[PDB]
Coordinates of C-alpha atoms in Angstrom, one line a residue:
Chain Y
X1313 CA 83.6 52.5 129.9
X1314 CA 87.1 52.4 128.4
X1315 CA 88.9 55.3 126.7
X1316 CA 87.1 58.0 128.7
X1317 CA 89.7 60.5 129.8
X1318 CA 91.3 63.1 127.6
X1319 CA 93.9 65.7 128.2
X1320 CA 92.6 68.5 130.4
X1321 CA 92.1 72.0 129.0
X1322 CA 95.1 73.1 131.0
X1323 CA 97.1 70.2 129.7
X1324 CA 96.2 71.1 126.1
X1325 CA 97.4 74.6 126.5
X1326 CA 100.7 73.5 128.2
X1327 CA 101.4 71.0 125.4
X1328 CA 100.6 73.5 122.6
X1329 CA 103.0 76.2 124.0
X1330 CA 106.1 74.3 122.7
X1331 CA 104.5 71.4 120.8
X1332 CA 102.7 71.1 117.5
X1333 CA 101.1 67.7 117.8
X1334 CA 97.4 66.9 117.8
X1335 CA 96.9 66.4 121.5
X1336 CA 93.2 67.0 121.5
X1337 CA 92.7 63.5 119.9
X1338 CA 94.4 61.4 122.6
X1339 CA 92.2 59.2 124.7
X1340 CA 93.2 57.3 127.8
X1341 CA 91.9 54.6 130.2
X1342 CA 92.3 56.5 133.5
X1343 CA 93.9 59.5 135.1
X1344 CA 97.2 57.7 135.6
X1345 CA 97.7 56.9 131.9
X1346 CA 96.8 60.5 131.0
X1347 CA 99.3 62.0 133.4
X1348 CA 102.0 59.5 132.3
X1349 CA 101.5 60.3 128.6
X1350 CA 101.2 64.0 129.4
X1351 CA 104.6 64.0 131.1
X1352 CA 106.1 62.2 128.1
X1353 CA 104.6 64.4 125.4
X1354 CA 105.6 67.6 127.3
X1355 CA 109.2 66.4 127.3
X1356 CA 109.0 65.5 123.6
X1357 CA 107.4 68.8 122.7
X1358 CA 110.0 70.9 124.5
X1359 CA 112.9 68.8 123.1
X1360 CA 111.5 68.9 119.6
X1361 CA 111.1 72.6 119.9
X1362 CA 114.7 73.1 120.9
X1363 CA 115.9 71.0 118.0
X1364 CA 114.0 73.1 115.5
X1365 CA 115.5 76.3 116.8
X1366 CA 119.0 75.0 116.5
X1367 CA 118.2 73.7 113.0
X1368 CA 117.3 77.3 112.0
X1369 CA 120.4 78.9 113.4
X1370 CA 122.5 76.2 111.7
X1371 CA 120.7 76.3 108.4
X1372 CA 118.6 79.4 108.1
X1373 CA 115.9 79.9 105.4
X1374 CA 113.3 82.5 104.5
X1375 CA 110.6 83.1 107.0
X1376 CA 107.7 80.7 106.5
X1377 CA 105.2 83.5 106.1
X1378 CA 107.5 85.3 103.6
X1379 CA 108.1 82.0 101.8
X1380 CA 104.3 81.4 101.6
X1381 CA 103.8 84.9 100.1
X1382 CA 106.5 84.4 97.5
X1383 CA 105.1 81.0 96.3
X1384 CA 101.6 82.3 95.9
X1385 CA 102.5 85.6 94.4
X1386 CA 104.8 83.9 91.7
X1387 CA 101.9 81.6 90.8
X1388 CA 99.6 84.6 90.5
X1389 CA 102.1 86.6 88.5
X1390 CA 102.3 83.6 86.2
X1391 CA 98.5 83.7 85.8
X1392 CA 98.7 87.4 84.6
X1393 CA 98.1 89.2 87.9
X1394 CA 99.9 92.4 88.7
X1395 CA 101.3 92.6 92.3
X1396 CA 100.4 95.9 93.9
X1397 CA 101.4 97.3 97.2
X1398 CA 99.2 99.9 99.0
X1399 CA 99.8 101.9 102.2
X1400 CA 98.6 100.6 105.5
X1401 CA 97.0 103.9 106.3
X1402 CA 93.6 104.6 104.8
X1403 CA 91.3 107.6 105.3
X1404 CA 88.2 107.9 107.3
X1405 CA 86.4 108.9 104.1
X1406 CA 87.6 105.7 102.5
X1407 CA 86.2 103.7 105.4
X1408 CA 82.9 105.6 105.1
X1409 CA 82.8 104.8 101.4
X1410 CA 82.9 101.2 102.5
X1411 CA 79.8 101.8 104.8
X1412 CA 82.3 101.5 107.7
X1413 CA 80.5 104.0 109.8
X1414 CA 79.3 104.0 113.4
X1415 CA 76.6 101.6 114.9
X1416 CA 77.9 99.3 112.2
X1417 CA 79.8 96.8 114.4
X1418 CA 83.0 96.7 112.2
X1419 CA 83.7 100.4 113.1
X1420 CA 84.6 99.4 116.7
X1421 CA 87.3 97.1 115.3
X1422 CA 89.2 99.9 113.5
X1423 CA 92.6 101.1 114.8
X1424 CA 92.5 104.9 114.5
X1425 CA 95.7 106.7 113.8
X1426 CA 94.4 110.2 114.0
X1427 CA 91.0 111.8 113.4
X1428 CA 91.3 111.4 109.6
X1429 CA 93.3 108.2 109.1
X1430 CA 93.2 104.6 110.4
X1431 CA 94.9 101.3 109.9
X1432 CA 93.3 99.3 107.2
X1433 CA 91.1 96.4 108.5
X1434 CA 90.9 95.0 104.9
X1435 CA 92.5 95.4 101.5
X1436 CA 89.3 96.3 99.7
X1437 CA 89.5 100.2 100.1
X1438 CA 92.8 100.6 98.4
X1439 CA 92.2 97.8 95.9
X1440 CA 89.0 99.5 94.8
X1441 CA 91.1 102.6 93.9
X1442 CA 93.7 100.7 91.9
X1443 CA 91.0 98.7 90.0
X1444 CA 89.2 101.8 88.8
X1445 CA 92.5 103.6 87.9
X1446 CA 93.8 100.7 85.9
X1447 CA 90.5 100.5 83.9
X1448 CA 91.4 103.9 82.5
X1449 CA 94.6 102.3 80.9
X1450 CA 93.1 99.1 79.4
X1451 CA 89.9 97.5 78.1
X1452 CA 90.9 93.9 78.9
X1453 CA 90.8 92.3 82.4
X1454 CA 92.3 94.1 85.3
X1455 CA 94.1 91.4 87.3
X1456 CA 95.8 92.6 90.5
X1457 CA 96.6 91.2 94.0
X1458 CA 98.2 92.4 97.2
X1459 CA 99.6 90.7 100.3
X1460 CA 99.9 92.9 103.4
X1461 CA 99.2 93.3 107.0
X1462 CA 95.6 94.3 108.1
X1463 CA 94.6 95.3 111.6
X1464 CA 91.5 94.7 113.7
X1465 CA 90.9 95.1 117.4
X1466 CA 90.8 91.7 119.2
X1467 CA 88.2 92.6 121.8
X1468 CA 85.4 93.2 119.3
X1469 CA 85.9 90.4 116.7
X1470 CA 87.7 87.5 118.3
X1471 CA 89.9 86.5 115.4
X1472 CA 92.8 85.8 117.8
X1473 CA 95.2 87.9 115.6
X1474 CA 95.1 91.7 115.7
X1475 CA 97.7 91.9 112.9
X1476 CA 97.2 89.4 110.1
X1477 CA 98.4 89.1 106.6
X1478 CA 95.7 89.1 103.9
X1479 CA 96.0 88.1 100.2
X1480 CA 93.3 89.6 98.0
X1481 CA 93.2 89.0 94.2
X1482 CA 90.8 90.8 91.9
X1483 CA 89.9 90.1 88.2
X1484 CA 87.9 93.0 87.0
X1485 CA 86.2 92.4 83.7
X1486 CA 83.3 90.5 82.1
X1487 CA 83.8 86.8 81.9
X1488 CA 81.8 84.0 80.1
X1489 CA 81.8 82.0 83.3
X1490 CA 83.2 84.0 86.3
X1491 CA 82.7 81.0 88.6
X1492 CA 85.1 78.8 86.7
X1493 CA 87.5 81.7 86.5
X1494 CA 87.2 82.1 90.3
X1495 CA 87.7 78.4 91.0
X1496 CA 90.8 78.4 88.8
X1497 CA 92.3 81.3 90.7
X1498 CA 91.5 79.6 94.0
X1499 CA 93.1 76.4 92.7
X1500 CA 96.2 78.4 91.7
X1501 CA 96.6 79.8 95.2
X1502 CA 95.8 76.6 97.1
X1503 CA 98.3 74.5 95.1
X1504 CA 101.0 77.2 95.5
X1505 CA 100.4 77.4 99.3
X1506 CA 101.0 73.6 99.4
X1507 CA 97.3 72.8 100.1
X1508 CA 96.1 71.1 96.9
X1509 CA 93.2 69.3 98.7
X1510 CA 90.3 71.4 100.0
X1511 CA 86.5 71.8 100.0
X1512 CA 84.5 74.3 98.0
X1513 CA 81.2 75.8 99.3
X1514 CA 79.2 77.5 96.5
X1515 CA 76.1 79.5 97.5
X1516 CA 74.0 82.2 95.9
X1517 CA 74.3 85.6 97.7
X1518 CA 72.3 88.7 98.6
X1519 CA 75.0 91.4 98.3
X1520 CA 77.2 89.6 95.8
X1521 CA 76.1 87.6 92.8
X1522 CA 77.7 84.3 94.1
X1523 CA 79.9 83.4 97.0
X1524 CA 82.5 80.7 97.2
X1525 CA 84.0 79.7 100.6
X1526 CA 87.0 77.3 100.8
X1527 CA 87.3 74.8 103.6
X1528 CA 89.9 72.4 104.9
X1529 CA 88.5 70.1 107.6
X1530 CA 85.7 72.5 108.4
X1531 CA 88.1 75.4 108.8
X1532 CA 87.4 78.7 107.0
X1533 CA 90.4 79.3 104.6
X1534 CA 89.2 81.7 101.9
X1535 CA 86.1 83.7 101.1
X1536 CA 85.6 84.5 97.5
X1537 CA 82.8 86.1 95.5
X1538 CA 81.6 87.1 92.0
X1539 CA 80.6 90.7 91.6
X1540 CA 79.1 93.1 91.2
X1541 CA 78.7 94.3 94.8
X1542 CA 76.4 97.1 96.0
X1543 CA 79.5 99.1 97.0
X1544 CA 80.9 99.1 93.4
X1545 CA 79.0 102.2 92.5
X1546 CA 80.4 104.2 95.4
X1547 CA 83.9 103.5 94.1
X1548 CA 83.0 104.2 90.4
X1549 CA 83.1 100.5 89.5
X1550 CA 80.4 99.4 87.0
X1551 CA 81.5 96.1 85.6
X1552 CA 81.7 92.4 86.7
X1553 CA 84.6 91.2 88.8
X1554 CA 85.6 88.2 90.8
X1555 CA 87.9 88.2 93.9
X1556 CA 89.2 86.0 96.7
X1557 CA 90.6 86.8 100.1
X1558 CA 93.1 84.5 101.9
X1559 CA 94.4 84.6 105.5
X1560 CA 98.0 83.7 105.0
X1561 CA 98.7 83.0 108.7
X1562 CA 95.7 80.6 108.7
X1563 CA 97.0 78.9 105.5
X1564 CA 100.5 78.4 106.9
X1565 CA 99.2 77.1 110.2
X1566 CA 97.1 74.4 108.5
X1567 CA 99.9 73.4 106.1
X1568 CA 102.6 73.1 108.8
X1569 CA 100.3 71.5 111.4
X1570 CA 100.9 74.2 114.0
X1571 CA 98.9 73.9 117.2
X1572 CA 98.0 77.6 117.3
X1573 CA 97.7 80.3 114.7
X1574 CA 100.3 82.6 116.5
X1575 CA 103.3 80.5 115.6
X1576 CA 103.9 81.0 111.9
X1577 CA 103.3 84.7 111.4
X1578 CA 104.9 87.8 112.9
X1579 CA 105.9 87.4 116.6
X1580 CA 108.6 87.9 119.2
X1581 CA 107.9 84.7 121.0
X1582 CA 107.6 82.3 118.0
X1583 CA 109.7 81.8 114.9
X1584 CA 108.5 79.4 112.2
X1585 CA 106.5 77.4 114.6
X1586 CA 109.1 77.2 117.4
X1587 CA 108.9 79.2 120.7
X1588 CA 112.2 81.0 121.3
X1589 CA 111.6 82.1 124.9
Chain Q
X843 CA 124.9 133.0 79.1
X844 CA 122.2 130.5 79.9
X845 CA 120.8 131.1 83.4
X846 CA 117.2 130.0 82.9
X847 CA 115.9 126.9 84.6
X848 CA 112.6 125.3 85.2
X849 CA 110.6 126.8 88.0
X850 CA 110.1 124.7 91.2
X851 CA 106.5 124.4 90.2
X852 CA 107.5 123.3 86.7
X853 CA 109.9 120.7 88.2
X854 CA 106.9 119.4 90.3
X855 CA 104.8 119.1 87.2
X856 CA 107.5 117.2 85.3
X857 CA 108.3 114.9 88.2
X858 CA 104.5 114.0 88.5
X859 CA 104.5 111.6 85.6
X860 CA 108.2 111.7 84.5
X861 CA 111.4 110.3 85.9
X862 CA 113.9 112.5 84.0
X863 CA 116.6 114.8 85.3
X864 CA 114.8 118.1 85.0
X865 CA 116.6 120.1 87.7
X866 CA 119.7 119.8 85.6
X867 CA 118.3 121.6 82.5
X868 CA 119.4 125.1 81.6
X869 CA 118.1 127.1 78.7
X870 CA 119.3 130.2 76.8
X871 CA 116.0 132.1 77.1
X872 CA 112.5 131.8 78.6
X873 CA 110.9 130.9 75.2
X874 CA 113.3 127.9 74.9
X875 CA 112.4 126.8 78.4
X876 CA 108.6 126.7 78.0
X877 CA 109.0 125.0 74.6
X878 CA 111.2 122.3 76.1
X879 CA 108.8 122.1 79.1
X880 CA 105.9 121.1 76.8
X881 CA 108.2 118.6 75.1
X882 CA 109.3 116.9 78.3
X883 CA 105.7 117.0 79.7
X884 CA 104.4 115.2 76.6
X885 CA 107.3 112.8 76.6
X886 CA 106.8 112.0 80.3
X887 CA 103.1 111.4 79.8
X888 CA 103.8 109.2 76.7
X889 CA 106.4 107.1 78.5
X890 CA 104.3 106.8 81.7
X891 CA 101.3 105.3 79.9
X892 CA 103.6 102.9 78.0
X893 CA 104.9 101.5 81.3
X894 CA 101.4 101.0 82.6
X895 CA 100.3 99.1 79.5
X896 CA 103.7 97.2 79.5
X897 CA 103.0 96.0 83.0
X898 CA 99.5 94.8 82.1
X899 CA 101.0 92.9 79.1
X900 CA 103.8 91.3 81.2
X901 CA 103.0 91.4 84.9
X902 CA 105.7 91.0 87.5
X903 CA 106.3 91.1 91.2
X904 CA 106.1 94.6 92.7
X905 CA 109.4 96.5 92.5
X906 CA 109.8 96.8 96.3
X907 CA 108.8 93.2 97.0
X908 CA 111.3 92.0 94.3
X909 CA 114.0 94.1 96.0
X910 CA 113.2 92.6 99.4
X911 CA 113.4 89.1 97.9
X912 CA 116.8 89.8 96.2
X913 CA 118.3 91.1 99.5
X914 CA 116.7 88.4 101.7
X915 CA 117.9 85.5 99.6
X916 CA 121.4 86.9 99.7
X917 CA 121.4 87.3 103.5
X918 CA 119.9 83.9 104.1
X919 CA 122.7 82.4 101.9
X920 CA 125.2 84.2 104.2
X921 CA 123.7 82.5 107.3
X922 CA 121.1 85.1 108.4
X923 CA 117.8 84.0 109.8
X924 CA 114.8 86.0 108.5
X925 CA 112.5 87.0 111.3
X926 CA 109.2 88.8 111.2
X927 CA 108.0 90.8 114.3
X928 CA 104.7 92.6 115.0
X929 CA 104.2 96.2 113.9
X930 CA 102.8 96.9 117.4
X931 CA 105.3 97.5 120.1
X932 CA 104.7 98.4 123.8
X933 CA 105.3 101.8 125.4
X934 CA 107.7 100.0 127.8
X935 CA 109.7 98.8 124.8
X936 CA 110.1 102.4 123.6
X937 CA 111.0 103.5 127.1
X938 CA 113.7 100.8 127.2
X939 CA 115.1 102.5 124.1
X940 CA 115.0 105.8 126.1
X941 CA 112.3 107.0 123.6
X942 CA 110.5 108.8 126.5
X943 CA 108.4 111.9 126.7
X944 CA 111.4 114.1 126.8
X945 CA 113.1 113.3 123.5
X946 CA 111.9 114.7 120.2
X947 CA 111.9 111.2 118.7
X948 CA 108.9 110.6 121.0
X949 CA 106.8 113.2 119.1
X950 CA 107.1 111.0 115.9
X951 CA 105.4 108.0 117.4
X952 CA 102.0 106.9 116.0
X953 CA 100.2 105.8 119.2
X954 CA 97.6 103.1 119.1
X955 CA 96.3 103.2 122.7
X956 CA 97.8 104.0 126.1
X957 CA 100.4 101.3 126.1
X958 CA 101.0 100.4 122.5
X959 CA 102.2 102.1 119.3
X960 CA 103.4 101.5 115.8
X961 CA 107.1 100.7 115.6
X962 CA 109.2 103.7 114.5
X963 CA 112.1 101.3 114.2
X964 CA 112.9 97.6 114.0
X965 CA 115.4 97.7 116.9
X966 CA 113.0 97.0 119.9
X967 CA 111.7 93.7 118.5
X968 CA 115.2 92.7 117.2
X969 CA 116.7 93.4 120.6
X970 CA 114.2 90.9 122.0
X971 CA 114.6 88.3 119.3
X972 CA 118.4 88.4 119.1
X973 CA 118.7 88.0 122.9
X974 CA 116.3 85.1 123.0
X975 CA 118.2 83.3 120.3
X976 CA 121.5 83.7 122.3
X977 CA 119.9 81.2 124.7
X978 CA 120.0 78.6 122.0
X979 CA 123.5 78.9 120.5
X980 CA 127.1 79.7 121.4
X981 CA 128.1 81.2 118.1
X982 CA 127.0 84.3 116.2
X983 CA 123.3 85.3 116.3
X984 CA 122.5 86.6 112.8
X985 CA 119.0 87.9 112.1
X986 CA 117.4 90.4 109.8
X987 CA 113.9 91.7 109.2
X988 CA 112.2 93.8 106.5
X989 CA 109.0 95.5 107.3
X990 CA 107.0 98.7 107.5
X991 CA 107.9 101.3 110.1
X992 CA 106.0 104.5 110.9
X993 CA 106.9 108.0 111.8
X994 CA 104.9 111.3 111.7
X995 CA 106.2 113.5 108.9
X996 CA 105.8 116.9 110.7
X997 CA 108.6 116.2 113.2
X998 CA 110.7 114.0 111.0
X999 CA 111.8 115.8 107.8
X1000 CA 110.9 112.4 106.2
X1001 CA 108.6 112.4 103.1
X1002 CA 107.5 108.8 103.8
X1003 CA 105.4 108.2 106.9
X1004 CA 105.3 104.4 106.2
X1005 CA 108.7 103.1 105.0
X1006 CA 110.2 99.7 104.6
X1007 CA 113.2 99.2 106.8
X1008 CA 115.9 96.4 106.5
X1009 CA 117.8 95.8 109.7
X1010 CA 120.4 93.0 110.0
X1011 CA 122.5 92.3 113.0
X1012 CA 125.3 89.9 114.0
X1013 CA 125.5 89.5 117.8
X1014 CA 128.8 88.1 118.9
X1015 CA 130.7 87.7 115.6
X1016 CA 133.6 85.4 115.2
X1017 CA 134.9 87.6 113.7
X1018 CA 136.0 91.2 113.8
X1019 CA 132.8 93.2 114.2
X1020 CA 133.7 96.1 111.9
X1021 CA 135.1 93.7 109.2
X1022 CA 132.0 91.4 109.1
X1023 CA 129.8 94.5 109.0
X1024 CA 131.3 95.7 105.8
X1025 CA 130.8 92.2 104.3
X1026 CA 127.1 92.4 105.1
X1027 CA 126.8 95.9 103.7
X1028 CA 128.5 94.6 100.5
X1029 CA 126.1 91.6 100.3
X1030 CA 123.0 93.8 100.6
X1031 CA 124.2 96.5 98.2
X1032 CA 125.3 93.9 95.6
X1033 CA 122.0 92.0 95.9
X1034 CA 120.1 95.3 95.6
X1035 CA 121.9 96.1 92.3
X1036 CA 123.9 99.0 93.8
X1037 CA 127.5 97.7 93.9
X1038 CA 129.2 101.2 93.7
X1039 CA 128.8 103.1 97.0
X1040 CA 130.8 105.3 99.3
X1041 CA 131.6 103.9 102.7
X1042 CA 133.0 106.1 105.5
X1043 CA 133.8 105.0 109.0
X1044 CA 133.2 107.5 111.9
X1045 CA 134.0 107.4 115.6
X1046 CA 131.3 107.4 118.2
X1047 CA 130.7 107.8 121.9
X1048 CA 127.4 105.8 122.0
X1049 CA 128.6 103.0 119.7
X1050 CA 132.1 101.6 119.4
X1051 CA 132.1 102.8 115.7
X1052 CA 129.6 104.0 113.2
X1053 CA 129.5 103.4 109.4
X1054 CA 127.5 105.4 106.8
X1055 CA 127.0 104.4 103.2
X1056 CA 126.2 107.1 100.6
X1057 CA 125.4 107.0 96.8
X1058 CA 126.2 110.4 95.2
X1059 CA 126.0 112.2 98.5
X1060 CA 122.7 110.7 99.7
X1061 CA 122.6 108.5 102.8
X1062 CA 121.8 105.0 101.9
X1063 CA 122.8 103.0 105.0
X1064 CA 123.6 103.8 108.6
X1065 CA 125.5 101.0 110.4
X1066 CA 127.0 100.7 113.9
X1067 CA 129.2 98.4 115.9
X1068 CA 128.1 97.6 119.4
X1069 CA 128.1 97.5 122.3
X1070 CA 125.7 100.4 122.9
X1071 CA 124.7 102.0 126.2
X1072 CA 121.1 100.6 125.6
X1073 CA 122.3 97.0 125.4
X1074 CA 122.3 96.3 129.1
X1075 CA 118.7 97.5 129.3
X1076 CA 117.9 94.7 126.8
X1077 CA 120.2 92.2 128.6
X1078 CA 122.9 92.2 125.8
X1079 CA 126.5 92.1 127.0
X1080 CA 128.5 91.2 123.9
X1081 CA 129.8 92.9 120.8
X1082 CA 127.6 93.2 117.8
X1083 CA 127.4 94.8 114.3
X1084 CA 124.3 95.9 112.5
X1085 CA 123.1 97.9 109.5
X1086 CA 119.9 99.7 108.6
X1087 CA 118.6 100.3 105.0
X1088 CA 115.7 102.3 103.7
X1089 CA 114.4 100.0 101.0
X1090 CA 112.2 102.5 99.2
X1091 CA 115.2 104.9 99.0
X1092 CA 117.3 102.0 97.6
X1093 CA 114.7 101.3 94.9
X1094 CA 114.4 105.0 94.1
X1095 CA 118.1 105.5 93.5
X1096 CA 118.6 102.4 91.4
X1097 CA 115.6 103.0 89.2
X1098 CA 116.3 106.7 89.1
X1099 CA 112.8 107.7 90.1
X1100 CA 112.3 111.5 90.4
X1101 CA 110.6 111.1 93.8
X1102 CA 110.7 108.6 96.7
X1103 CA 106.9 108.0 96.4
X1104 CA 107.0 106.0 93.2
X1105 CA 108.6 102.7 94.1
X1106 CA 106.9 101.7 97.4
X1107 CA 103.4 101.3 98.7
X1108 CA 101.0 103.7 97.0
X1109 CA 97.5 104.1 95.4
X1110 CA 98.9 106.6 92.9
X1111 CA 102.1 105.1 91.8
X1112 CA 102.9 101.5 90.6
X1113 CA 106.5 100.5 90.0
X1114 CA 107.5 104.1 89.1
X1115 CA 104.5 104.9 86.9
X1116 CA 101.6 107.1 87.9
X1117 CA 98.3 105.2 87.4
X1118 CA 95.9 108.1 88.0

């Protein structure tokens, strides 16, 4: 049959712990060749991992996630966006205003702090407030963005990451062609993240006026949309707007070719793609 | 003669949209006070809206984020690794810090479930990271992290429940521990735009020595020189020096904001200006 045997599922997990190669593409003739190559790639993975750690101690740099955030934010500031920073705590009434109530499945993913406050699962509740407040101070476009941790329970959503860093940009204000405005903003982020080549998926929407999803090799990377949305009235928003949400850990993982999504972000086991324990 | 000041309520009204020094003002009589009150209230509201429109005309990075970048670039150039650790920490990790059900620091902890909580401090994760990096080098282990920490306000005397902490540490310096610690303090304060500060060294029975940094009588930094009696519980058996900074407080003092709620994360304030 020829080129039949791949790495086993257990072999893949062992290789990915310290290594960042693409081991799921290797094919082999028989079990002996697989085990021989597995032994060699495990040794290379562990040795390459040790070299990278010593390279960081010898020549430290900014954290890869913090570097990713600075590169995108500077590009968005240069595009006229205001960087805002909102608290991680949001109120139960803010969640309810987002239709985040019970028997709605997202409610079970929410980390509750007390009876009245919770960890934000998304940046939309606070961004809604800042959008409306800035409309009172200008009649031109309201262009804001925030990068910050969001929290969702793993055992109700998958997602693999309970804490994840989101980037959400918003351009509130009527546009002659909000789609081109959206695609230009996505291009600004994707080039600044170091991922200039990607795929766009444009579909008409039920709740929004138009959605735009960004793909890289079939992987979901960004979900954008053109307003209005049926939740705009609940937040005293009554004008067109376009926005885009980016998972920054997911962007960093794809750019740096990390084998899992838990290596580039916040961790006590990993540091910039290398396992320190 | 003049013994009339703004009332505490009037001070709160002025500090709502203004960043002036209102608690310093004395007036000859009550009519001169309330006339100056409307003057400063109108000036504060006028200048506050100018700043908002000025930021829409020329956007920039957030004041806190820009401060983090200025300090982090300076520490990286000094040889520090920037690490980022999860906000969630385990109850066992807090117990290793002797943050158990008996101490009042326990009552500040925001609990997530039965075994996890929001970090009230960066030390537990930095204990783990610095010790794991010692396995990979024979020289000094130098790391720092800036991130949100959480403490309940009722038991804390804090006025921020979410605050951005900067913690740097040098495990096994070369290198006199107290001397290298003052160098790192100077690097952070210079990069933060606060070069003039008061540094006092105190003795200790839990650390080898403590160091506190103040600007005009307000604590700005609390540093210490290990070893500490918690180090063996985290498998650390070598001298170290570390410093902790409250970044919102640093930004508030430099920009001369009237409250500590104007420079950090907020839905009411943006870079010192009230947007609602």
